[PDB]
């Protein structure tokens, strides 16, 4: 691949289900074309994929732990929304009951 910007493969109960990408315009979740399976959330029915927003989908923003938000204050810091998408990408395999591996090499 060649940049920019940011892409994450999205796994649910072990299975690759789609791709969450950020760019200048914003955020893009989309389901794999052969993913018939349990929806990620009621906000993301399989028949409506893809989805696009100028701000981080509420569902994905919701996966960010309280704990990491409260750790800003101290005091006070950016939260940005790219900062949240970055957190999702940095952790990742272990902190969300669903999972995201950053699509690298990129
Ligand atoms: Cl099923
Ligand atoms: Cl189902
Ligand atoms: Cl749109
Ligand atoms: Cl809008
Ligand atoms: Cl949402």
UniProtKB/Swiss-Prot annotation:
Region forming the signal peptide: none
Q: Which InterPro entries match?
A: HipA_N1 (IPR017508)
Superkingdom of this entry's organism? Bacteria
Protein name in UniProt? Uncharacterized protein HI_0666
Give the organism, scientific name.
Answer: Haemophilus influenzae (strain ATCC 51907 / DSM 11121 / KW20 / Rd)
């Amino acid at each position: 691949m060649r940049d920019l910007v940011r892409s994450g493969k999205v796994f649910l109960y072990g299975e690759f289900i789609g791709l969450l990408r950020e760019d200048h315009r914003g955020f893009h979740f989309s389901y794999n074309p052969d993913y018939q399976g349990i929806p990620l959330s009621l906000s993301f029915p399989i028949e409506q994929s893809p989805f696009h927003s100028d701000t981080l989908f509420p569902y994905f923003a919701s996966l960010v732990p309280e704990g990491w938000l409260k750790h800003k204050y101290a005091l006070h810091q950016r939260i940005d929304e790219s900062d949240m998408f970055r957190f999702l990408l940095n952790n990742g395999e272990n902190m969300l009951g669903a999972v995201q591996i950053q699509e690298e090499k990129q």
